[PDB]
């Protein structure tokens, strides 16, 4: 049953056995169960005290790293940055979230920015990141009136400073995020497969505050995300074939034996090699 | 009662349909007590790499087959770490465990008598010359009985149930398992000249079916238990 | 979780998961062998113990392998499943392969066996190294022979099958998380710029 | 020694003190015990 | 036996001695032992209280200094930096580790960087150091996809800031690092002498994040290492002849009497000089 | 104090004029405790036929001689029942005992430094290529020092008393005896690739007399004590 | 007064409080005392 495990288990001394009516090594996997043959009952062992800690394979250690979610470069001479939030854009963060079905965490977002004026040096600049939820009106110009909003959460930072960090709580209307969704989105007969409306967060708009001067720029924005306080349910098998798009889970397969469609593991000469 | 599992060392044998295993003369193997020891060196008791199941070569059972035999100290003199302790030491003392495996379908028939004979002094047929170092001392392969009806020494087969034995009846089971203790007049013995036991399997009822013609082999495993050696030499 | 023993060519699809055994005419014959290399491209890369433990680089524990026989009810036979520590080369005959840790299995009413691969090592851990013949990365060889023959009647099919499973025991351990060597393509995917109006 | 002066509870650090574990839901899911 | 020594020892007053049967000054070094003649038994002494502390000759004070392990300059107009980790590159750190056989410590690594654009001034730059373990795939280009990994440990820093510092624990699979190894690496008949696979750590890849602009650069990277929590076993004699390579311990010797092959100490005119 | 007798197994060594025997770093060999074991098989502890004195081949000491060395796990890999357990098993753990014998008359002189070096990574002279499987791994015979003044790796000989050692001064004694424990970072080790210790004897003061010209050989005995093996294989 | 707010124990400072010493393993390695 439920028990607190701090380190790995240990082995106790084994004697010879010639018992009738008892077979440890036989079982039946047709029941759906997993084998329970202790090594004490298959070979002759000694007694070994074990000090190996298992604290690194936790779920909160396996997940909580800073991974890139967005990268986009805009020139300044649509003059700003707008990104509808998803976690399906980069394939190395994605495959680690595809192991579970439900997730419940608190993110921690870092906006890192660098510039390259195209006098090759540069004066100081000032940025603005604004978190527009769903429903609210998004700007469409650098100096739109939607940037004067006191209600949307904004943050100002400079190029010369350490990067900006905030934290965002658990935002869903259910009790967990659905990584997978086997349903439709609308009440009509023809909607969009594979998305739920219970997981849509909104936009994130980034501009640069300084007025265009004599010289044009090139601004490159990176956004990182680190989960915190993670709870996870229902593990799943990992994705093997490469991804093809974002809105679904299509598959194409590579042409030659490693990760092909009819072969995941590359070929061998014969079985008795 | 049918299902059984043995384990000795890093070896294990699993069977599902087998009648009980018998102990020869009610005994179980053990070490040498203090009030029966003679040699005064400390014995070498390795207790692992010499207490495993060593399998021999399988023999094919056909309709004209007539029996097989083996010599138990001699069949293991070039196998593993049992065969290396025997060549370097001068005396030994051990007890064995035999396990015979032969299976077929629901449509076959047949029967094997698996018997273990102490001090089986053989004899040649229709001559006066004794057999030599040839025709005995075949390592890891066994001779075939020429006249199995008289056990190739004159004594009848019909009273060979006085020795420890089991049966392999293909209707009922497919395995036989015998445990043998140390049996000799002396507490230890030179292993390269004298052989205590003699395993011998004899097909009484020959096999037969009308399904197809397919090979049916017979396999023997031997596990020396509670072995100890003495008197170290060079080769 | 099952594993691709039959990863040879001209085996299309999910026929790569089972191995075919059949009757034969010689005394003792080899059936298959498994290269125990998680890091390299082997049969163990696509399992649950394979995909999860490639994110880490040190590992320590025991393993177990479970074989299910999928023949008919009228079919009998025996097998032997041995494991050799990594000192030498792979064993060829049954005479040099019985000396490792082996199990001898009879095809009975219940149709699974379990071969424990014990943790034999000098150090405390082992590494997922790119060299197969390193001293801290080479694990051993698992190989299977015929004890007796595979015998069927005239009405059953001659070719029976085996399915191979693998999992870990309760003392398995992992350390020093890294990046997975599996995903290595850099292909640009559709509807990426749709979020960027 | 953790430290936060923020009024919200989700602003804190992570925690690695959760060593509870029930492995016999994936490995032994059956009803009748063997 | 074992005892706690804080300061050096003291001397007690000596009287005249003319004892028969007792000789303090004679011994036998054929036993392998060392002399134990107290100065109280060789000359006539006074009583001296001694306050000299011995706390500076500790092993954790002799070793734990910041020593240079790497220095390499790359031009930016293979566009990045890659270094398979060893401690045999610079001969002044090396000779202090060659005194012991086994070591067990926790390092503390400082990456110090400076740049020289070849407008001679410069704007702000941003770096990235990534620690690739053994087995993992190393990048081969500045903008490779291996830099988006959330799993490898990375760190971002600027030129204008104080330098970066991290710490790295004891990473070996044994219980100590083997400075010397009298064996081979593989199971085959012909491997590589003098290296063990139990001590191989991996790569350390450093790039610069900013896109190439109008002007080329020249970046110079230095890496320092300070051991901490040191345990040391089995002292050895020091290396006298100069080093010749990294993968082994060959020796050549200088041409003239100081540190030559047939003479370590330089010559003198006569023995009765 | 001069007279001494060792006995291990069925072997014994008797000497009359010998200075005391030293323990390396104050230690004595022992078995592996439970809280330090890693491998989970039962170890093979033979405790006799692997705990004896095995003598090597004697070397002749002349006026132009310059030193000799040996590798202690490697010198015994084809000798007796130590060399048979090593080839069949995968791991070992042991500690040794060295005994060096060299005698002369009252009219000879000379001195030998008998030192034991852990992890003696050698080096080749005046090249960049590392030494291979040749020029190391000489079983039961040892190489001769090319440049013994720098121990053939660059470190000075004048500080080689930091290792456990004794002296054989022909004026005083004619024997030297050193006890070595298990010294490695790991609890067990593969014996066919890695060598822990390195025995090396170096004539500092060369011999000399005016009586006659006669041979003076040097003999080395090694006794592995408290050895145990694990991980059984085929060859 | 040492100070660390990190959760890992290897992140701390050094320590110079280890004055234990056994010199008679290198200087007197023999068995029979003189």
Residue ranges per structural domain of chain B: 1-235
* A29 three-class SS: helix
> Chain C neighbours among E 182-201 (CB < 8 Å)?
185-188, 196-198, 200
Going by C-alpha positions, the residue among F104, F88, F137 that lies closest to residue F213 is F104
CA A67, CA E152: separation in Å to the nearest integer? 10
Return the closest-CA partner of residue B174 out of B207, B200, B148.
B207
Q: Is C143 in contact with C34 (CB distance < 8 Å)?
A: yes
Enclosing H/E stretch for E61:
helix E59-63
DSSP state of A243: P
Cα separation of E258 and A150, whole Å?
A: 79
Chain E residue with the nearest C-alpha to that of F159: E237
Identify all chain B residues contacting F10, using CB atoms and an 8 Å cutoff: 41, 232
Q: Which two tokens stand for residue A171?
A: 């935002």
Which of F155, F182, F198 is the best substitution to test chain E (most E C-beta atoms within 10 A)?
A: F155
Cα distances (Å, whole numbers) of residue F142 to B41, B73, F113, F201: 34, 41, 16, 11
Output E34-39 pairs: Cβ under 8 A, ≥24 positions apart.
Answer: E34/G26, E34/G27, E34/G28, E36/G28, E36/G34, E39/E11
Q: Report DSSP letters for B40-72, one per residue.
A: -SPPB---SSSSS-EE---EE--TT---EEEET
Looking at the DSSP bridge assignments, the partners of residue A81 are A206
In sequence order, the β-bridge partners of residue A109 are A225
**Site of tokens 């590589």:** E192
F11 touches chain B (CB under 8 A): no
Count how many Cα atoms sit within 13 Å of the Cα of residue B169 in the half-sphere of its side chain. 5
CB atoms within 10 A of CB E51: 7
Give residue for tokens 């790359």.
E74
Residues of A in contact with E213 (CB under 8 A): 116-118, 120
Identify the CATH assignment for B1-235 out of 2.60.40.420, 2.60.120.20, 3.40.50.300, 3.30.450.30: 2.60.120.20
Residue D14's contacts (CB-CB under 8 Å, 6 or more residues apart) are A60, A64, A228, A229
* Cα(F67)–Cα(F64) distance, integer angstroms: 10
Q: What is the DSSP string of E104-172?
A: EEEB-EEEEEEE----------BEEEEEEESSSPPP-STT-GGGG-SSSEEE--BSSSPPEE--B----
Starting at the earlier edge strand, list the strands of the sheet with C126-127: C126-127, C56-60, C173-177
Contacts of A160 (CB under 8 A, 6+ apart): A124, E124, E160
DSSP result, E90-118: SHHHHHHHTTEEEEEEEB-EEEEEEE---
CATH number of the domain to which A94 belongs: 2.60.120.20
- Cα–chain-centroid distance for residue C46? 11
Output Rg (C-alpha) for chain E, integer angstroms: 27
What DSSP state is assigned to residue E15?
-
Joined tokens for residue A72: 């986009």
Beta pairing class for F11-15 and F22-23: unpaired
- Other Cβ atoms closer than 10 A to E95: 13
Distance CA(C24)–CA(C147), nearest Å, equals: 12
Q: Are F179 and F97 in contact (CB under 8 A)?
A: yes
Q: Do G32 and F1 touch (CB under 8 A)?
A: yes
- F21 — contact with chain G (CB < 8 Å)? yes
Alpha helices in chain C (DSSP H): 48-52
Alpha-carbon distance of F24 to F165, in angstroms, equals 8
Q: How far is CA E30 from CA A31, C156, F6, F173, F206, in A?
A: 75, 84, 20, 8, 17
* CA–CA separation, E183 and E242 (whole Å): 23
The SS3 of residue B229 is strand
DSSP state letter for E14: -
- Residue for token pair 């002494």: E45
Round to whole Å and give the CA distance between F221 and F57: 9
Q: How many residues are listed for chain E in this entry?
A: 273
Show the tokens assigned to E95: 């000779």
How far is residue C117's CA from residue C102's CA, in Å, rounded to a whole number? 10
The tokens 């009980």 sit on which residue? Answer: B20
And the tokens for E103?
């070591």
Six token digits for residue F212: 């006659």
Selected for mutation to probe chain F from G23, G24, G31, G33 (highest F CB count within 10 Å) is G31
Q: Structural domain of residue E243, as residue ranges? A: 1-273
Q: What are phi and psi of F170, to 5 degrees?
A: -70, -15
Residues A42/A24, Cβ–Cβ less than 8 Å:
yes
**Which residues, 6 or more positions from F61, have their beta carbon under 8 angstroms from its beta carbon?**
F102, F203, F207, F216, F217, F218
CATH class of C1-197: mainly beta
Residue B158: which residues within 8 A CB-CB, separation 6 or more? none
CB-based contact, E144 to chain C, within 8 Å: yes
Q: How many domains does chain E contain in total?
A: 1
Apex F78 CA angle, F72 and F80, nearest 5: 100
Chain D residue numbers with beta carbons less than 8 Å from the beta carbon of G7 are 16
Distance CA B177, CA F185 (A): 46
The four Cα atoms C133, C135, C136, C141 give a dihedral, to 10 degrees, of: 60
Closest to E4 in 3D by CA, of A43, C47, G20: G20
Residue C5 near residue A263, CB atoms below 8 Å: no
* Residue E188 Cα to chain centre, angstroms: 31
Q: Which of E86, F150, E136 is nearest to C176 (CA)?
A: E136
Separation CA F175–CA F15 (nearest Å)? 8
According to DSSP, the residues that pair with C32 across neighbouring strands are C144
d(CA A162, CA A112): 9
Give the DSSP letter of residue B82.
Answer: H
CB atoms within 10 A of CB B122: 14
Locate E187 and state its tokens: 């199971």
Structure tokens at E183: 């064996």
Q: Which stretches does DSSP call E strand in chain A?
A: 3-4, 67-75, 81-84, 100-106, 109-115, 127-133, 153-155, 164-165, 177-178, 202-208, 218-225, 228-235
CA distance A99 to A236: 5
CA-derived radius of gyration, chain F: 19
Nearest CB to A270: which of C8, C169, C172?
Answer: C8
Pairing between β-strand E67-75 and β-strand A218-225 as defined by DSSP bridges? unpaired
Q: Which two tokens stand for residue E154?
A: 């990375």
CA dist C196 and F43 (Å) reads: 66
- The per-residue DSSP string of F109-144 comes to --EEEEEEEES-----BSSSSPP-SSSS--SSS-PP
User: With contacts defined as CB-CB under 8 Å, which chain G residues touch D5?
Assistant: none
What burial class does residue B38 get, using C-beta atoms within 10 Å of its C-beta: 0-12 exposed, 13-18 middle, 19+ buried? exposed
Measured in angstroms, the resolution is 3.4
**Residue with the two structure tokens 């009790």:** A175
Q: CB under 8 Å to F180, separation ≥6 — which residues? A: F24, F29, F72, F95, F96, F97, F98, F116, F164, F197
Check if the beta carbon of residue F98 is closer than 8 Å to that of residue F92: no
- Whose CA is closest to F38, among C170, A52, A48, C84? A48
Residues 60-89 of C with CB under 8 A from A: 60-62, 64, 66, 68
Contact (Cβ atoms closer than 8 angstroms) between residue F25 and residue G31: no
Q: Do G31 and F24 touch (CB under 8 A)?
A: no
List residues of C whose CB lies inside 8 A of any F CB: 62, 84-88, 91, 96-97, 99-100, 118-124, 135
Task: Select from C57, C123, C135 the Cβ nearest to the Cβ of E134.
Answer: C57
The pair of structure tokens assigned to B2 is 């049918």
B127: exposed, middle or buried (Cβ count in 10 Å: 0-12, 13-18, 19+): exposed
Half-sphere exposure of E82 (CA within 13 A, CB side): 13
Spatial separation of the C-alpha atoms in residues A248 and A194, rounded to whole Å? 6
Strand runs labelled E in F32-156: 54-55, 59-60, 68-71, 89-101, 111-118
Q: Are F100 and F201 in contact (CB under 8 A)?
A: yes
DSSP class of C74: T
Distance of alpha carbon A264 from alpha carbon A241, whole angstroms: 8
Q: Which residue has the tokens 């202690």?
A: F72
| A24 → closest Cβ in B5, B10, B21 | B5
Burial-class residue G28 by CB neighbours within 10 Å (0-12, 13-18, 19+). middle
Phi, psi of A92 (to 5 degrees): -95, -35
Q: How far apart are the first and last CA of chain A?
A: 44
- The answer to whether the CB of C40 falls within 8 A of the CB of C7 is no
Strands ordered across the beta sheet of C78-84 = B4-8, B11-15, C101-106, C78-84, C141-146, C30-35
Backbone φ, ψ for residue F92 (5° rounding) = -145, 170
Q: CA nearest A28 in D: which residue?
A: D34
């Amino acid at each position: 049953i439920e028990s607190i495990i701090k380190t790995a288990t240990d082995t106790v001394k084994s004697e010879i056995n010639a018992e009738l009516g008892v077979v440890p090594s036989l079982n039946a996997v047709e029941t759906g169960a997993t084998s329970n043959t202790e090594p004490e009952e298959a070979i002759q062992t000694r007694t070994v005290i074990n000090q190996h800690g298992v604290s690194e394979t936790l779920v909160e250690n396996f997940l909580s790293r800073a991974a890139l979610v967005s990268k986009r470069s805009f020139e300044y001479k649509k003059n700003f940055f707008k990104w509808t939030i998803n976690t399906r854009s980069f394939v190395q963060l994605r495959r680690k979230l595809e192991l579970f079905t439900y997730l419940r965490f608190d993110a921690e977002i870092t906006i890192l920015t660098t510039v390259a004026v195209n006098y090759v040096g540069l004066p100081d600049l000032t940025l603005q990141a604004m978190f527009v939820p769903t429903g609210a009106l998004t700007p469409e110009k650098q100096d739109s009136f939607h940037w004067q909003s006191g209600s949307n959460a904004s943050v100002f930072f400079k190029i010369s400073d350490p990067p900006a960090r905030i934290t965002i709580p658990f935002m869903c209307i259910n009790s967990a995020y659905s990584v997978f969704y086997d349903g439709f989105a609308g009440f009509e007969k023809n909607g969009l497969y594979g998305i739920n409306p219970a997981d849509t967060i909104g936009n994130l708009c980034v501009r640069i505050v300084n007025e265009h001067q004599p010289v044009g720029f090139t601004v490159t924005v990176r956004v990182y995300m680190k989960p915190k306080h993670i709870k996870a349910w229902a593990p799943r098998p990992p994705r093997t074939l490469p991804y093809m798009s974002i809105a679904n889970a299509n598959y194409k397969g590579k042409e030659r034996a490693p990760n092909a469609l009819n072969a995941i593991i590359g070929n061998r000469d014969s079985v008795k090699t | 009662d049918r299902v059984l599992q043995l384990k000795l060392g890093n070896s294990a044998i699993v069977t599902q349909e087998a009648a009980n295993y018998c102990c020869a003369y009610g005994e179980w193997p053990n070490y040498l007590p203090d009030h029966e020891a003679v040699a005064i060196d400390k014995p070498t008791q390795p207790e692992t790499a010499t207490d495993r199941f060593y399998t021999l070569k399988s023999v094919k059972w056909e309709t004209g087959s007539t029996g097989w035999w083996w010599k138990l100290p001699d069949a293991l003199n070039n196998i593993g770490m049992f065969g290396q302790n025997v060549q370097h030491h001068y005396l030994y003392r051990s007890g064995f465990l035999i396990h015979v495996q032969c299976n077929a379908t629901k449509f076959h028939q047949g029967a094997l008598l698996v018997v273990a004979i102490p001090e089986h002094q053989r004899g040649a047929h229709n001559t006066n010359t004794s057999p030599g170092f040839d025709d005995i001392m075949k390592g890891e392969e066994g001779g075939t009985f020429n006249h199995p009806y008289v056990l190739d020494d004159g004594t009848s087969l019909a009273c060979a149930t006085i020795f420890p034995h089991q049966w392999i009846n293909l209707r009922t089971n497919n395995s036989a398992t015998i445990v043998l203790p140390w049996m000799n007049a002396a507490p230890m013995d030179f292993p390269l000249r004298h052989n205590q036991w003699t395993l011998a399997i004899i097909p009484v009822v020959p096999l037969g079916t009308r399904t197809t013609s397919s090979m049916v082999p017979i396999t023997v495993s031997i596990a020396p238990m509670c072995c100890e050696f003495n008197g170290l030499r060079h080769a | 979780s099952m594993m691709e023993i039959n990863n040879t060519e001209s085996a299309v699809g999910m026929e790569r998961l089972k191995v075919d055994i059949s009757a034969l005419t010689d005394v003792d014959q080899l059936l298959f062998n498994i290269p125990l290399d998680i890091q390299l491209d082997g049969p163990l890369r696509n399992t649950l113990v394979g995909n999860i433990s490639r994110y880490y680089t040190h590992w320590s524990g025991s393993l177990e392998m479970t074989f299910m026989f999928c023949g008919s009810f009228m079919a009998t036979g025996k097998l032997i499943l041995c494991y050799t520590p990594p000192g030498g080369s792979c064993p060829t005959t049954r005479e040099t392969a019985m000396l490792g840790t082996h199990i001898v299995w009879d095809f009975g009413l219940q149709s699974s066996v379990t071969l424990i691969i014990p943790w034999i090592s000098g150090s405390h851990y082992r590494m997922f190294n790119n060299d197969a013949k390193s001293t801290n990365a080479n694990v051993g060889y698992v190989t299977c022979f015929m004890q007796t023959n595979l015998i069927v009647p005239s009405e059953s099919s001659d070719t029976c099958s085996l399915i191979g499973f693998i999992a870990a025991k309760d003392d398995f351990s992992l350390r020093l998380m890294r990046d997975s060597p599996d995903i290595g393509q850099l292909d640009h995917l559709h509807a990426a710029e749709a979020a960027y109006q | 020694n953790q430290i936060n002066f923020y009024k919200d509870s989700y602003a804190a650090s992570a925690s690695k003190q959760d060593f509870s574990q029930d492995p016999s839901k994936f490995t032994e899911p059956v009803v009748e015990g063997l």
